[PDB]
Design a protein around this ligand. Structure first.
Ligand SMILES: O=[N+]([O-])c1ccc(O)c(O)c1
Ligand SMILES: O=[N+]([O-])c1ccc(O)c(O)c1
Ligand SMILES: O=[N+]([O-])c1ccc(O)c(O)c1
Ligand SMILES: O=[N+]([O-])c1ccc(O)c(O)c1
Ligand SMILES: [Fe+3]
Ligand SMILES: [Fe+3]
Ligand SMILES: [Fe+3]
Ligand SMILES: [Fe+3]
Lengths: 202, 238, 238, 202, 238, 202, 238, 238, 202
C-alpha cells in the first residue's frame, strides 16, 4: 500500500495555474470559472458571496475557493452518484473563483441544491461543499454551506448534528438576502479566533 | 464491485495546519481541531471534465504562450502516473500546474522579484490522465524563488500541481521538486511535512533514459491519491 | 626567499590525454608519452595584466551584455580563492570564464542547439584576483547542454574557467559544476578524471549565508594552482 | 598540502570566453589578441603561422593557441625574471589566437626572442613556449618552437638535447620563409601519428 | 501511441571493442570511436519472420538432429522472457542458439578438439517468442571448451544466442552461462564486460520447480533488449 | 528500468547456429540465406560483395554479415515503417551470409534500395544497413553502404554529413562494376588501420 | 497451453508427520516413508462446486447463525488472495473455515471448556474465490483455546481453513493466526513447522486501511497452493 | 571593502519564543510570527564605548566588590574570543556579565534563596574585547541556583553575558555553563535550544594549561556573533 | 562557517550585570543609564515612557529596555554610519533602563531623531530602535517606535509599509503628550493578545 502524496500550500500565485484570466494570462480558450448556471440549468438561481478572514479579522486577498454541489433534485453530476436518478444534463456542479485582490470578496452564480441522501437511509439538508486554498494554508480546508431558510431540514441534518459543540453549527449556515429579485446567501468564513468556521476532515 | 468510502486521510502523512516555521500559517490556521465525518455521496462524488474543451497546447508550457519566439530556459518533459493508495490507476483526472519562469519570476501582478520576465512564457498548463493514470507535459525548468518568510528565504525550484479526480475527498493541491536541488533541505514549506519519506515523495526524479537527444531532459513524478474501499456486506453510504 | 621550480604536476590528479569514453580525445591525443623537463626561466615566468584595461562590468555577466533588458535566468554570484598547492594566495591572476545561457545555449556560431538565445546575455567575463587570491563575479546559472559524444549526451550545468598567473607552468583551463546537479554522475568529460576526490574538487558549493535577499544566490569555488618550492642551497634554475 | 585543480577540455566554444571577437561578442573594450608587437617594441618582427592536425591528418578548426616568450634580449617581461637586466618596456611577451574556422590556419605577429639562460649556467637557443587548447584535449599541450636559422644554438640547447629520440627534435624547429620583406616561420603541429610533435610536461 | 527512437545504448553496460585480455580483439577492433547518429526509419525497422517456415523440432536440440538414437548428455530445458528495457514484452522475435555438445565439441569444420563428437547431436535451434515475450527450447548441457587465448584457456559451459526483433537497433548476439560453473570467474571473454552486475545478467539460473521428474532439469534465462520511447510532442523521426 | 543484456562475441563457430548449411548441418528445412531477390521482387538486381580486413590487412575468414534494406521504393518490409505506402510483397529486406573459409569473400544477391525519408522531412540517399559479427568482435559493428553512382543524393545525405571528418565518408561508398549484364557493387570493410571503415552506434 | 503435473510438494516447507512435541501425532503418524508417485489424471483433477447452492450469508459468521441477536465479540473482516506457487490466481476454489467463539469455545459436542457459549454464533462459513483468486468473509475474532497436550497448553487465537481447488494434489487444510498474538511463539502445533518463514506464512496481518469506521477491523491473509507446470514437449500425463 | 547587511539570523539555531517547558515564556512570547525586514543603517550601526570610563577592576569580580576581605569560592579565570560568523574578530565589543555567588545566591532584592550572601562579592563585571576579539575576566565559580519552574528546578552553575558590538543586529544576551556540570542535561532553559550542537556551544571548557598554580583555574569560552557580507555590486543598503 | 551563539533569557536578575545601581550594587564609577541628553546635545528633548504587558495584561516588573537612535539630523554616532555627514559630538545614541519593580513603568530622556536614509534611496520616518529583555523572553525582542506627529513621514516609511497587516502598524506609533513644557511620547508594548506589538527579526 502507498501513502497519499503530501499536501503543500497553494502559494500566493495560485491564480496563475487555476485562474489564468484573473492573473492576466490568456492561454486557454475555455476557462473554468465561478458560474455554474447554464442557459438550460434547472432550479432557482442564487448568488453565493462572502469573505475569508484570518486570525486578525483581516480578509485574505489571495484565497482561492471551489464548490461542489448537486443539482436542483439533489443528484450529483458524477458517475459516482448511485441514486439511479437522472441528473440535470446542463449542470457541472462545480465552480472556482478567487477573492478580489482589493476587497477580498468572492462569489459564485449557482443553483440552490436539492436535498441529498445521507448514510443509513437518512436525508441531508441542502448544502454546498466548499474548499479553501491559499498562502499560509498547508492543506485545503473543507467546510459546508447550509441555508438559513432550510431551518427544519438543517435541524435533522446528520453532519450538523455530528458536531457536539452546538454553538458552532451556526457558523455553517449562510444568510439569505434579496438584491431586488435576486436571492443572495452571505457566507463569511473565519479561519481563526471567535466564531471560527467549522472545518471538516472528509 | 460496490464501492464504499475513501480510506481515512492519514494526518500523520501531511503537514499540520499550524507550522510556526512557515509564518503565514500562524494567522491562517484554525485553532480548533478538524471535525471528522463519515462520508456521504457528497464526499465520494466529483465533477467530470471533457477533453474536448482543452486546446492542443494546454500541456505544452514551452509553446502555449510563445508569441514572437521560444521561452528562455531548460527544456524539460515531466511525466508520471496517478494512482489511488491501493495502486489502482486514476483515469481522466484533471491535472493543473503552474510555475515561475527560468528566472524564478512568476507572471502574476503581485510578483515584484527582480528576476527577468520572459515575454514568451506563461507558466501554466493542464491535462487529463489517460486510462492508465498516465500524464505528461512539457515546460521550462523553473528557477528558485526568493520570498519573505525570513528575509533571505528561497523556495527551491518547484512546480505547483492540483488534482480533481473521482471523489471530492481526493481533492489535492501540492508541489513537486527536482532531484538534487540543494534548497530542498532548507525550505520551511517543505519542512512542514513531518516524515522524511513523505518529503521525498514530492521529488521528481531524473529519468535519463527518457531524455530526448539534443532536445529535452525528462523527470519522472508519480502522484498517489486517496482510494475507496470495496464493500462486501452492508452498504451504509446510502 | 629565493624561489626554485614549481612542484612536479601530479599526472594522477588529472585526466589522461587518451580517454575512449570522451570520443574526440581519440584523434586529438598524442600517442607518445609527454617528455618531462627540468624548469628554466621560461617555465617559471608569466605575463602581467594591468587592471586598468578592464571595464567596470567585465566580471558582471548579468549586465556586461544587457542591451534592452536583463537576461532571463537564475541570478547567481560565484566567488572563492585561488591558492597554490602550498596554500599561498595567488595575487593578480587573470581569471577568464565563459558559459552557455539559461537555456543551455552558447553564443557561438557553431552552436545550433534548439535552446533559446538570450539577446541580453553574452556568456563571458574576466577579473583579476586580489591580494588574498580572492575572486568574485556575477552571472546567470547556465542550463545543461546536449552534445554528441553518444547521441543522448548532456553536459551538466557548467562554467568554463581559465587562469594565467605567476608561472607558465601554472597555465590551467578547466570547468566547475554546481552542487547537487545529477548530470555530474554521468558526464564522460568529468569522468576522464581518475579519482573521486578530484572530481569533487570541481564542484562549486552552495554558500547560503552569502545569498543576497530577494536578489541572488551564491556559490563558493576555490581553485588550487601548482606552487613553487623555496631554495635554501644551490640555485640551479639559472 | 592541497592538490592542483584537475584540468578539463576547453570545449568547442572556448572562443566565447577567450576570444570574444572571433565569436562575434563585443563586451570588452580591450581585447587580448595575437599581436605582440607594439609601436616601440624592439627586435626583428616575424610572423609565426601554421596548423594543428589530428590523428587523421585533418586540421583542428576549433583550436586555441597561446605563446609566451622573452624580448629581443632574452629577458621575460615578468617579475619572475631574475636576470637583473631591464626588459623591453613595450612588450607583453604573450599572445593568443585561434585557428580559422574554415582553413584551420593560425598566426601571431611577434618578435624573434633572444637567447635565454638555461639551468646551471647554460644558454638556451631562442624559442617560444606554446600551448594548445581544444575540444578533445583534456590538458593543455605544451611545446616549444625553435628556429631553423639558429642551427648552432639549437645544437647546444639543453631541452632539445634532453630528448633522447633525436629524430623527434626536428618536430620542434620552425622553417623560415620570406613573403617579400617579411620573415615568416612555419610551424605545423601534429598531435598524432607520424612526425608527431614533441609535447612537454613542464 | 506514437513511437520515437530507441533509447541510447549504454556503452558502459557492454564490453569495449578493444580488450587486450581477449587477444583476437586486438586486430579486430576499430581504433576510431563509433560515430553516434540520430535514428531514422532504417534503425527502428526490422524484418518479420513467419513461424510457418519453422519445423516442429527447430527448438528441440535433443531431437532435431537425432539419427539412430538420442544424444549423450544432460537433458535440460531452457526458457525465459524477452523484454525491452522498459519492461515491455518482445513479441515474435527470432531467437537463434548454437552450442557445443556434452564433450565441449562443436560440429564445425574448424573445431579439432579431442572432445568426442555425438552423431546424434547438432547444436543449433531457433524459435519465435510468443505474445508475452516467452521462449523455450530443449537441449543437452554443453561441456566447457578449451581454446587458445592463453594456451590453457577454457570457456565455461555456454550457449550462444542471437536476437532479431522489432528494430535494427535491437540486433543483439551474446552468450549465457550456467549458475554455479566455476570457469565463469576466470573467462577472459566474460570479463570484457565492465560491471559485475552485467556479468551476472548472462547467467542462467537453476529453475528447480520446473524440473521434469525422471526426465529433464530446467534453467531460467531472461533477455533484455533496447526499448523505444513514446513521443508526445514533435515527431522528428520522419 | 532494466539494463540491456550485455553483448558477447559471436565466436569462431557462429556458423553453426546462424548458417548451418555452411557448417554442414542440415536440421532446418527452410534456411535463411544471402538471397533477397524472389521471383516477383521489384527493382534492379545487384550483387553486393567484398571482404573484411583486420588490423594486419588480412581478411577475416570467420566473419558473419547481415544486411537490412528497404524495397525499390524506399519502403521497409516492417510494421515499424510509418510511410503509409505499400511495400513490395515479395521482399524480406534482410539477408545473411558468411565469408568464404578460404578466400574471405562474401556476397548478397539483392535489390538496389530506393531513397528513404530522413529525420525532419529530409531525404536519405539510398543505402543498406550492414552489421558485422565475428571472433574478436565483442559487439556487432554497424555501418552503412552507399552507392557511388548516387553522387548527388549522397552529397545531401544527413548521416554522411553528420561525419565531421569528411575524408572518412568515402569509406562508406561502394564501387559499381559490371560483370557483363550484372551490376556489382564492391564494398571492402577495414576494421583497423588506414582507411578504417566508419562504424556507427545506432 | 498444455498443462503438465503439479510441482513436487516441498516436504521441507511443511511439518513432518511425526512431531513428539505435538503428542497426538505419536500414534497417528505412519512409521513408513510416504511413497511418491508420478501424477496421473486422478491427481490433477478435482470437483467443481457451483455458487448457486450457497446461501447469501454463508461467508458471514456474524449473521449466519444469529438467532435473537448479534454474537458477542470483535467484529473482524478477513480477506486475501489464493494463488498457486507460480503466482497464478486460483479461481472458484472452495474455501471453508471454522473457529471457536470470542470465549475460545467451540460449538462441538466434544468441547467442554468453561468458556461461555454464544447462542448467536456458529463458527463456520464457506465461499468461492472469484476470478482473481480473491476471497472475503466476516466473523468474530476467536479467543485463545486451552487444550491438553501439556496440561497448561493454549492455542493462540486461530481460524481453521480448508481448500479444494483445481487439482486433488492441491487439497490443503491449515490454520491462520493473528498478527501480534503472543501465544504464537509457544504453540506446539505451529512449531511442528520447520522454518521460521513458513510459520509467518500463517499469520494474518492487520490491514488498517481496510478497517470500516465504527464497525469492523480487517486482516489480510493470502494463501499459496501448489501449481502446475506447462508442457512444451512430450505430454506423458496421458 | 564595502559592507552589506548582516547575514540572516538562523532561527533554527536559537530557542523559539514559545517553550511550554519554560513556564514564564507562556505569557511573555508573542503569538504572532516575527516580521523580517531588509536591513537599513539603523540595523547595521551600534554605539561605541571608550575604555577610559572603565575602572581598573571592572573585569575582576574577585576584587571589584571586596570590602573587608576576599570572596568565598572557587577562583576561576574565564577568557576566550569573540568572532562574527565568518570568523572575523570582533574588536572593542562591550561584554557585560553577571552571576550568583558561590552559594548560588544573587545580590538582587528579589532573591530570597537560603543560600548565604558573600559581603565581599558583587557578581558583575564588564570589559571590551581587544583587536583580536579576545576577552578575559576573573571571578568566583557560581553555585547552582534553585528556582520555581517546577518546584524542584535547579539552574546549573552559570554566568550571564551580554554583548553590544558593531551592529544593532548583533545585540545578544545569553548564558554559558561549565564543562561537566550534571545539571546541564536537565535544565528547561538550556533545553529551549533545539539542537544538541548549539547547547554545547554554551559550555565553557576547562583550560588546564592556563591554570595558574596555587591560584586559579581557567575556562575557555568563545562567542560567535552574526557577520556582515561584503558587497561587490549594487549597494542597496542606502 | 560558524553558527551564532544561541540566545538565552536574561533572567529575573538581569539588573545585577546591566543596571547595578537599580540592584543596589556600586562597583562601577561610570554607570550606563537611560539619559541620552548631554549638556550640549542638539535637538528637541523628549521623554519616552511606557509599560510592557504580558499575555494577561499585567506589566512586567523585571524587564530591561534599550534603545538605539540617530541624532537630530538622522546620523548615527557609529563608524558604521556611511552618510558622510558629521554626527552630534555629544550624543551616544544609546541608553538602557529597567521597569520599576513596583509600577512597571520605564522611561528614557532622549532627543527626537531626525529622518534616516532607507534602502534604495528612500527615506525612513523618524524612529527609535528598541529591544526588550526579560525572564520568560528567550531572545531579545526587537521593535521600533515611531511618532504620531510625523503622520506624513510614517505614511511613506518603508518598514511600516512592509507590514502587510495594516491594522498592526499603529502598534508601533507612540502618542505625543505635554507635561507643561515637556514633550512626552507614550509607548506601551503588548507582548501577547490583542493589539500585540509588532516585533521584528532584524
Ligand atoms: O508564501 N508561500 O507560501 C509561497 C511563496 C512563494 C512560492 O513560490 C510558493 O510556492 C509559496
Ligand atoms: O565536446 N566537448 O568537449 C564539449 C561540448 C560541450 C560543452 O559544453 C563542453 O564544455 C565541452
Ligand atoms: O575465440 N572465441 O571468441 C571463442 C572461442 C570458443 C568459444 O566457444 C567461443 O564462444 C568463443
Ligand atoms: O527564570 N529564569 O529565567 C531564571 C531563573 C534563575 C536564573 O538564575 C536564571 O538565569 C534564569
Ligand atoms: Fe511557488
Ligand atoms: Fe561547455
Ligand atoms: Fe562458443
Ligand atoms: Fe541566572
Amino acid at each position: 500500500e502507498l501513502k497519499e502524496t503530501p499536501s503543500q500550500t497553494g502559494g500566493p500565485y495560485v491564480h496563475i495555474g487555476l485562474l489564468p484570466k484573473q492573473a492576466n494570462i490568456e492561454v486557454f480558450e475555455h476557462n473554468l470559472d465561478n458560474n455554474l448556471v447554464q442557459d438550460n440549468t434547472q432550479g432557482q438561481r442564487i448568488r453565493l458571496e462572502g469573505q475569508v478572514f484570518d486570525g486578525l479579522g483581516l480578509p485574505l486577498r489571495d484565497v482561492l475557493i471551489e464548490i461542489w454541489q448537486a443539482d436542483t433534485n439533489g443528484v450529483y453530476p458524477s458517475q459516482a452518484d448511485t441514486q439511479g436518478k437522472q441528473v440535470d444534463p446542463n449542470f457541472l456542479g462545480w465552480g472556482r473563483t478567487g477573492a478580489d485582490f482589493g476587497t477580498g470578496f468572492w462569489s459564485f452564480n449557482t443553483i440552490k441544491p436539492g436535498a441529498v441522501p445521507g448514510r443509513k437511509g437518512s436525508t441531508q439538508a441542502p448544502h454546498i461543499s466548499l474548499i479553501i486554498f491559499a498562502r499560509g494554508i498547508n492543506i485545503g480546508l473543507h467546510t459546508r454551506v447550509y441555508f438559513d431558510d432550510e431551518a427544519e431540514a438543517n435541524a435533522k441534518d446528520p453532519v450538523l448534528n455530528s458536531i457536539e459543540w452546538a454553538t458552532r453549527r451556526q457558523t455553517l449556515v449562510a444568510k439569505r438576502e434579496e438584491r431586488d429579485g435576486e436571492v443572495v446567501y452571505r457566507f463569511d468564513i473565519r479561519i481563526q479566533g471567535e466564531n471560527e468556521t467549522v472545518f471538516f476532515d472528509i | 464491485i460496490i464501492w464504499g468510502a475513501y480510506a481515512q486521510r492519514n494526518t500523520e502523512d501531511h503537514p499540520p495546519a499550524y507550522a510556526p516555521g512557515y509564518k503565514t500559517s500562524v494567522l491562517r490556521s484554525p485553532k480548533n481541531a478538524l471535525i471528522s465525518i463519515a462520508e456521504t455521496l457528497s464526499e465520494v462524488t466529483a465533477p467530470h471534465f471533457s477533453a474536448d474543451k482543452f486546446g492542443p497546447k494546454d500541456n505544452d508550457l514551452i509553446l502555449n504562450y510563445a508569441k514572437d519566439g521560444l521561452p528562455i530556459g531548460e527544456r524539460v518533459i515531466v511525466h508520471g502516473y496517478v494512482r489511488d493508495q491501493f495502486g489502482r490507476p486514476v483515469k481522466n483526472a484533471l491535472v493543473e500546474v503552474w510555475q515561475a519562469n527560468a528566472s524564478g519570476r512568476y507572471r502574476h501582478p503581485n510578483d515584484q522579484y527582480i528576476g527577468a520576465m520572459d515575454p514568451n512564457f506563461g507558466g501554466c498548463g493542464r491535462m487529463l490522465t489517460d486510462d492508465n493514470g498516465y500524464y505528461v507535459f512539457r515546460t521550462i525548468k523553473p528557477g528558485p524563488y526568493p520570498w519573505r518568510n525570513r528575509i533571505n528565504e528561497w523556495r527551491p525550484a518547484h512546480i505547483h500541481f492540483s488534482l480533481i479526480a473521482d471523489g471530492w475527498a481526493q481533492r489535492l493541491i501540492s508541489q513537486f521538486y527536482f532531484e538534487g536541488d540543494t534548497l530542498i533541505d532548507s525550505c520551511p514549506i517543505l519542512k512542514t511535512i513531518p516524515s522524511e519519506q513523505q518529503r521525498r515523495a514530492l521529488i521528481a526524479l531524473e529519468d535519463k533514459s527518457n531524455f530526448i537527444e539534443a532536445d529535452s531532459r525528462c523527470y519522472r513524478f508519480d502522484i498517489t491519491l486517496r482510494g475507496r474501499r470495496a464493500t462486501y456486506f452492508e452498504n451504509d453510504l446510502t
